[PDB]
Amino acid sequence: SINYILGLDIGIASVGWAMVEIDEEENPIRLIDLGVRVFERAEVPKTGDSLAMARRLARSVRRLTRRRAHRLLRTRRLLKREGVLQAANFDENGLIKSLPNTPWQLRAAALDRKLTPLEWSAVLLHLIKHRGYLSQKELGALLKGVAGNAHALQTGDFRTPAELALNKFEKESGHIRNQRSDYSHTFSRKDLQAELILLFEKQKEFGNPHVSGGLKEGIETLLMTQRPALSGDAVQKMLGHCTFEPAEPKAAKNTYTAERFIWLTKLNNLRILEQGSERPLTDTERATLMDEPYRKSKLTYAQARKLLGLEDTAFFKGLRYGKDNAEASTLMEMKAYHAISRALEKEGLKDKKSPLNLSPELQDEIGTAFSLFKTDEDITGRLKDRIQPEILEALLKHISFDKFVQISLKALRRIVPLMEQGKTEEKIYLPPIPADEIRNPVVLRALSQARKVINGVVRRYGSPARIHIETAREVGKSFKDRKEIEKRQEENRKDREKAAAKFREYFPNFVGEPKSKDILKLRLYEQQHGKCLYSGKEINLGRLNEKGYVEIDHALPFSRTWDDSFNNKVLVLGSENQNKGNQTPYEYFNGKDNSREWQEFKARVETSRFPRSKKQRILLQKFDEDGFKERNLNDTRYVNRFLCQFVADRMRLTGKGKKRVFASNGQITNLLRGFWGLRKVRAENDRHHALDAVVVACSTVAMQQKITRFVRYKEMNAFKTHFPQPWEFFAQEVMIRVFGKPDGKPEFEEADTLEKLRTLLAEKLSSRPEAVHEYVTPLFVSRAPNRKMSGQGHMETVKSAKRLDEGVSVLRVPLTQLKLKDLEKMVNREREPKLYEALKARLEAHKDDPAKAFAEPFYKYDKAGNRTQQVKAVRVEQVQKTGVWVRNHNGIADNATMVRVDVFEKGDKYYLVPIYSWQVAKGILPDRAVVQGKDEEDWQLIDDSFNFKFSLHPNDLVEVITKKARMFGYFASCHRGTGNINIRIHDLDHKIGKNGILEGIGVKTALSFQKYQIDELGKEIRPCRLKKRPPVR
Amino acid sequence: MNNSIKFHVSYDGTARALFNTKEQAEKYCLVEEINDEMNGYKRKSWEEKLREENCASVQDWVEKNYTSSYSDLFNICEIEVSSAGQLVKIDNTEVDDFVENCYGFTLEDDLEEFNKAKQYLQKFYAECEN
RNA sequence: UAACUUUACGUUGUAGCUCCCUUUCUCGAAAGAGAACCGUUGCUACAAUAAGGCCGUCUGAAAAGAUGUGCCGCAACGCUCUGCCCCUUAAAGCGCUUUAAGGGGCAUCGUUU
């Protein structure tokens, strides 16, 4: 029932919001609410991988192990039913009893010998288990090892690959099987089938029974039967669908039509940029250069310039270069066309001169056949039964295509003829973000949390009249892209520091601290070659620092163009060219008739070494003022465009009815933040998100107009006048409401209750009674709850647990990691004293570096040492208090995460019961609390005497009222060996605790340990009480 | 001066290492986690990350791609001990106030209990400080 | 991109052979061996490769047996379903409980699968 505008600050891990009440003409009058919603990034915390991809890899590994076990089980069933395997010779598990552990020697000697059925089953099960690799970076290396062993058997004197395997791998070293990354031992599946059939032949020749039965077949049934691969249905389902015919799957870029379409689109989005003039390619030019991707191989931008007729200084737009535009880039190529041509050249079908006889439709069919199927067999078998076979083996020798495009085939095949010539219901609450449209985990999570915030706002207050979303420059970028951005920011900092050093060296007489304006003045003057860009005079370097002599002025007027760029500024003197006004350097320099002044102005802005983009922007004077202003005012990224369309379509907005979703740009938000007096501190707190959300929610069109008219008044003389503020004392009110402390003074105590915040607002803003309304509450950053009860069950290292009566967890440590600290905790340390001093010498010789000391092989020595054996890894005892029993109770692991931590009274003492993920899977709910020092076996036992209070999850709000002080925040972790919780302050304030967390909280004797519940808006703070203990399963 | 700050990195309450500055202490947590991940299904993916970029070996890769997300259950409790071997301050809390905070009773409650509790920590970290 | 086929590595267990090397006992005899036992280097095997949970499935009286190109299990998202916490309204009673309704929040519930 209140008109208001909502802003947002969507980030990778935080969505700060704010709602600003507006009047009948959408002019902000008050600020009625705000807050920040912090959440975990939807990425792997290390290397920023895809969580879904990692889970899929784990599931695929599980599937592989399950299939291998099932295949070996079926092999054992076959051996039990095909003739005999000495029926009932199996254990209780069904395995093989007394299986001969020499199956490589069995494959070697089975060529001429009558194998015992036990040895016959040993060799056979060996063949199924290690059944080689089939064709179906790292893969190329593995195929290299496969090919090497394949050639050895073809040209060698050994029939079976295993025969050469042992007979030469025992000469080379002591191992026959593959080790670490030595692919010299890998075999191939076709050679294994040949070995199997010749083995059956030999076992038949030597009168061995159990050979001629149904086995000889069933063995190939188990050996070569394989799960097939994907089809076009996966491409349809997991990617987009064509609007015209969703039934149609997606084309591939390795087709002629797709390459033509992308080339034509690139032509449509390419212009000619010379002397600050942007001109599209003419029809004659388009026809002239269209032949280039087929006449030659690659289309370099410099090559394109050389082929056509244009000036040398003419660069190309659309090439998003960070810096160093001197090097030319490449436009695009016919990947499929050139690949087919070079394959035909290499296979005696092309000479780089004859035209490609295959039709473009035929090329499309070939590309679709090569891309839809991931194996050679299916391609060769089907091919849609189209083309001749000779070129089929020609292509399959080298050509491999795997890619897809965004449009359906037909759709492209119908648009191309028309383009070659040159041409739901709205409701109150926002619906779920469509996972199909946003195929990015981090952005999807951010948008879902933003939708949660919007829904909470709508529920509490009503439909927003307008939405002012703007996201950080990091959303919509890969993790490597974000790392590149932060790195470039780091060196951009170093560079700023070096520039400040340069300025202080040049002008030691200058006092104070070099700000951005003067440092920009100096750097640009260095780049301007010591000359003003209005009259072309030599200006006084000494007088550069002082005010009045020089002043930064945007050549393109700010009121009509709305440009605020890093280097779109011209170092003009002042009082000598104050007649520019809002006229742009076209009529002030009189470029209408190419006056002389214009001529040398262009010459001095192009001959003198200035950035190319600056040379271009300063010299446009031929743009659409409103369109260019809206290009530099809004943002048109994929995510912002999607948000605009989705929010406009799928929720109520009681606005003016034309465009009620306004996606802003980062530069304009930063500029208006600067004008309205940001100051203070940021990036050390989590409330600057709400600050920027308030700032963007006051960037209404009326305010861009008040800014426009003020800047227009300021351009010419027209003569402390405050810059347009949304209301009086805007900065004071906003920074009291966001942070709780006045401006410039981050040392005062935060007013974190309604009473003290209201009193502070009334005492500091007595002139503005609208700062204190019914909705004035202190900001409380809300962290997204994580009540999930699943996760890694146990670290991935399995440690021997025979000696678990003590604390030791003996494990094999490779020598390339054996440190001096790992020699003390070694098993045969007194049992074999000589090797203890033999290994310790190598630690001391190379200065405690196992990688270099043990790069050469280490060896044991006899009493009179004579090079007996070699040490590669040695056992290392490690203390193991508690762990998870894994591998059918053959090894122990380490606990992964606490999925829940219950609390228990009886003694005014809160006992904490840690519940781990492996316990939830087994349905086991622990009955033991935590006590310091003593192990789990001595832990306090839980019975009916212990009152149950609640259960703790990570990022779940709690309050420990210890006697000394009260502590509030979100539970993070617990010291298992010490039993103290870790509490994160709500805003992660960097001046409280260790980087915002309160470690080592004393809960065992706290006056009251209880947990609260926080709304998605960060409001409605109240304790939550459980009645009964919740089951784990 | 005599007060020297140490760092007792412990996982699941089990003491594992002991360093001199927090930087190596947090770096060590990554190396332990990465070497643990490389023991199973994630070893295949982790091999390229050590190879596609010139950051061979886990220790060197972490040295430059250091992240504050060093997994949970890793406890980096920061104690400081003077040259006399007697513990003075823990994290940001003095030993007299530490027992008042992490053990939950002041010095005026039971002095001889400290000889059973405060002195208990001294021998507990005496075994840790090896 | 999608998902894919994989063999391969690794960790732990068992057994075979093999390195050093404990007490041990046997042989002499003082360090060298014969049996053990216990550690453990290397190699070759099989088993497991999350913790755990389901089917299909032929027998059948089922303890169980016969079987399979077998399925799910570390994620995101959601509220049709059950449950937790939470307000809102009404009804009664005895703030507290019950009943009823509505709105959320979050999973051990649901979908992608």
* Residue B89 β-bridge partners: B80, B94
CA-wise closest residue to A843 among A861, A823, A826, A825: A823
CA-wise closest residue to A264 among A145, A422, A431, A131: A422
Smallest Cα distance from B37 to chain A, Å: 6
Cα separations (Å) of A413 from A235, A259, A340, A364, A368? 19, 12, 21, 10, 14
Assess if residue A528 is contained within a domain: yes
**Residue A595: both structure tokens together:** 């006056």
User: Rounded distance, CA A1007 to CA A960, Å?
Assistant: 8
Q: Are A609 and A545 in contact (CB under 8 A)?
A: no
**Residue A303: both structure tokens together:** 């090559």
Task: Name, in order, each residue with C-beta under 8 angstroms of A128's C-beta and a sequence gap of 6 or more.
Answer: A71, A72, A75, A219, A222, A223
- The three-state secondary structure class of A412 is helix
Cα separations (Å) of A11 from A187, A203, A444, A700, A734? 50, 69, 11, 22, 21
Nucleotides of C under 7 A from a protein CB: 1-16, 18-22, 31-32, 39-53, 66-79, 83-87, 103-108, 113
Active-site annotation holds for A902: no
Residues A270 and A393 in one domain: yes
Provide, for chain B, the percentages of residues in helix, strand and coil under a 3-state DSSP scheme, each rounded to the nearest 5: 45, 15, 40
Burial A307-326 (b: 16+ CB within 10 A, else e): beeeeeeebbeeeeeeeeee
The answer to whether A879 contacts B91, with C-beta atoms less than 8 Å apart, is no
Residues A256 and A399 in one domain: yes
Q: Are A190 and A152 in contact (CB under 8 A)?
A: no
CA A787 to chain centroid: 24
User: Rounded distance, CA A232 to CA A369, Å?
Assistant: 11
- The three-state secondary structure class of A926 is coil
* Residue B61 β-bridge partners: none
Nearest to B13 among A45, A46, A975 (CB): A975
Q: Are A215 and A76 in contact (CB under 8 A)?
A: no
> If you ran DSSP here, which 8-state letter would residue A664 be given?
B
Smallest Cα distance from B126 to chain A, Å: 14
Assess if residue A241 is contained within a domain: no
DSSP count for chain B of H helices, then E strands: 6, 7
**Residue A990: both structure tokens together:** 């960097």
Half-sphere exposure of A96 (CA within 13 A, CB side): 24
Domain boundary among A487, A512, A537: A512
User: Rounded distance, CA B101 to CA B95, Å?
Assistant: 9
Nearest nucleotide, C1' to the C-alpha of A921? C52
Residues A576 and A656 in one domain: no
User: Measured in angstroms, what separates residue A826's CA from nucleotide C22's C1'?
Assistant: 15
Cα separations (Å) of A208 from A83, A101, A670? 12, 20, 86
Q: How would you class A795 by CB atoms within 10 Å of its CB: exposed for 0-12, middle for 13-18, buried for 19 or more?
A: buried
Cα separations (Å) of A30 from A127, A165, A211, A458, A689? 78, 82, 91, 18, 19
Residues A775 and A855 in one domain: no
Q: Are B16 and B9 in contact (CB under 8 A)?
A: yes
Residues A716 and A745 in one domain: yes
Catalytic residue among A468, A518, A553, A554: A554
> According to the entry, how was the structure determined?
cryo-EM
Query: Chain B: residue nearest A58 by CA?
Result: B41
H helix intervals, A214-334: 215-224, 232-238, 256-268, 283-290, 292-295, 301-307
H helix intervals, A462-611: 479-506, 516-527, 558-561, 584-587, 596-606
CB count, 10 Å around CB of B84?
9
Q: Are A112 and A204 in contact (CB under 8 A)?
A: no
The answer to whether B41 contacts A797, with C-beta atoms less than 8 Å apart, is no
**Residue A186: both structure tokens together:** 């890998």
Nearest nucleotide, C1' to the C-alpha of A374? C4
CB count, 10 Å around CB of A166?
18
What residues make up the domain containing A1006? 896-1023
Residues A125 and A153 in one domain: yes
The side-by-side arrangement of strands in the sheet containing A956-961 is A997-1001, A981-984, A966-974, A956-961, A1009-1013, A1022-1023
B119 close contact with A: CB closer than 8 A: no
**Single-letter amino acid, residue A584:** T
CB count, 10 Å around CB of A101?
10
Q: Are A469 and A642 in contact (CB under 8 A)?
A: no
Q: Are A502 and A510 in contact (CB under 8 A)?
A: no
Smallest Cα distance from B28 to chain A, Å: 13
The side-by-side arrangement of strands in the sheet containing A948-952 is A911-916, A898-904, A948-952
> If you ran DSSP here, which 8-state letter would residue A663 be given?
-
Residue A903 has φ and ψ, to the nearest 5°, of -125, 150
User: Rounded distance, CA B80 to CA B5, Å?
Assistant: 4
**Residue A782: both structure tokens together:** 């809300």
* Residue B79 β-bridge partners: B90
Name chain B contacts of A881, Cβ cutoff 8 Å: 12-14
Nearest to B102 among A797, A973, A980 (CB): A980
Residues A913 and A994 in one domain: yes
Burial B40-70 (b: 16+ CB within 10 A, else e): ebbeebbeebbeeeebeebbebbeeeeeeeb
Query: Chain B: residue nearest A1005 by CA?
Result: B104
**Which residue matches tokens 């900092």?**
A493
Active-site annotation holds for A9: yes
Q: Are A441 and A50 in contact (CB under 8 A)?
A: yes
Q: How many CB pairs under 8 A join A and B?
A: 103
**Which residue matches tokens 């762990």?**
A883
Cα separations (Å) of A366 from A245, A252, A626, B95? 22, 11, 48, 77
Nearest nucleotide, C1' to the C-alpha of A801? C12
CB count, 10 Å around CB of A46?
19
**Which residue matches tokens 């109770």?**
A889
Cα separations (Å) of A808 from A883, A938, A939, A941? 12, 18, 20, 25
- CA angle A650-A655-A656, nearest 5°? 120
Task: Name, in order, each residue with C-beta under 8 angstroms of A761's C-beta and a sequence gap of 6 or more.
Answer: A733, A736, A737, A771, A772, A776
Smallest Cα distance from A1032 to chain B, Å: 21
User: Measured in angstroms, what separates residue A524's CA from nucleotide C53's C1'?
Assistant: 69
Cα separations (Å) of A537 from A56, A521, A529, A548, A572? 67, 16, 11, 17, 11
Number of domains in chain A: 7
The answer to whether B77 contacts A964, with C-beta atoms less than 8 Å apart, is no
Q: Are A433 and A643 in contact (CB under 8 A)?
A: no
CA-wise closest residue to A629 among A562, A551, A717: A562
Residues A532 and A505 in one domain: no
The contacts found for A591-598 with CB under 8 angstroms, 24 or more apart, are A591/A621
Task: Give chain A's radius of gyration (CA, Å).
Answer: 37
Name chain A contacts of B102, Cβ cutoff 8 Å: 978, 980, 1000, 1002
Residues of A with CB under 8 A from a CB of B: 45-47, 49, 54, 57-58, 61, 137-138, 795-798, 817, 821, 851, 879-882, 894-898, 933, 954, 962, 964, 972-973, 975-978, 980, 993-994, 999-1000, 1002, 1004-1006
Burial A730-740 (b: 16+ CB within 10 A, else e): bbbbbbbbbbb
Q: Are strands A873-876 and A811-814 parallel, antiparallel or unpaired?
A: antiparallel
User: Rounded distance, CA B92 to CA A994, Å?
Assistant: 9
**Which residue matches tokens 């002030």?**
A588
> If you ran DSSP here, which 8-state letter would residue A798 be given?
-
User: Measured in angstroms, what separates residue A140's CA from nucleotide C7's C1'?
Assistant: 14
Cα separations (Å) of A220 from A46, A187, A375, A458, A651? 44, 17, 20, 65, 61
Residue A712 has φ and ψ, to the nearest 5°, of -65, -40
Task: Name, in order, each residue with C-beta under 8 angstroms of A969's C-beta and a sequence gap of 6 or more.
Answer: A957, A958, A983, A984, A985, A986, A997, A998
Residues A272 and A385 in one domain: yes
Name chain A contacts of B47, Cβ cutoff 8 Å: 138
Task: Name, in order, each residue with C-beta under 8 angstroms of A914's C-beta and a sequence gap of 6 or more.
Answer: A898, A901, A926, A930, A974, A976
Residues A607 and A740 in one domain: no
Q: Are A550 and A578 in contact (CB under 8 A)?
A: no
Residues A529 and A494 in one domain: no
Burial A12-43 (b: 16+ CB within 10 A, else e): bbbbbbbbbbbeeebbbebbbbbbbbbbebbb
Q: Are A993 and A822 in contact (CB under 8 A)?
A: no
User: Rounded distance, CA B118 to CA B26, Å?
Assistant: 27
Assess if residue A397 is contained within a domain: yes
**Residue A393: both structure tokens together:** 């083996």
Residues A153 and A265 in one domain: no
User: Rounded distance, CA A598 to CA A590, Å?
Assistant: 6
User: Rounded distance, CA A465 to CA A323, Å?
Assistant: 42
- The three-state secondary structure class of A123 is helix
Residue A649 has φ and ψ, to the nearest 5°, of -75, -40
Assess if residue A129 is contained within a domain: yes
**Residue A563: both structure tokens together:** 């440009």
Cα separations (Å) of A816 from A316, A326, A824, A856, A875? 53, 47, 16, 10, 13
**Residue B128: both structure tokens together:** 């840790």
Helix/strand/coil (H/E/C) assignment for every residue in A807-834: CECCEEEEHHHCCCHHHHCCHHHCCCHH
**Residue A295: both structure tokens together:** 């006449």
Cα separations (Å) of A463 from A14, A57, A466, A744? 23, 43, 9, 36
Q: Are A570 and A610 in contact (CB under 8 A)?
A: no
Assess if residue A1029 is contained within a domain: no
Half-sphere exposure of A829 (CA within 13 A, CB side): 13
Residue A160 has φ and ψ, to the nearest 5°, of -80, 140
CA-wise closest residue to A883 among A807, A788, A821: A807
Q: Are strands A4-10 and A466-468 parallel, antiparallel or unpaired?
A: parallel
User: Measured in angstroms, what separates residue A398's CA from nucleotide C68's C1'?
Assistant: 38
Query: Chain B: residue nearest A50 by CA?
Result: B45
CA-wise closest residue to A600 among A590, A610, A613, A611: A590
H or E element that contains A16: strand A14-22
- Find the length of chain A: 1033
User: Measured in angstroms, what separates residue A432's CA from nucleotide C79's C1'?
Assistant: 11
CA-wise closest residue to A255 among A145, A115, A360, A358: A360
> If you ran DSSP here, which 8-state letter would residue A27 be given?
-
**Residue A346: both structure tokens together:** 């290499």
Catalytic residue among A9, A553, A692, A956: A9
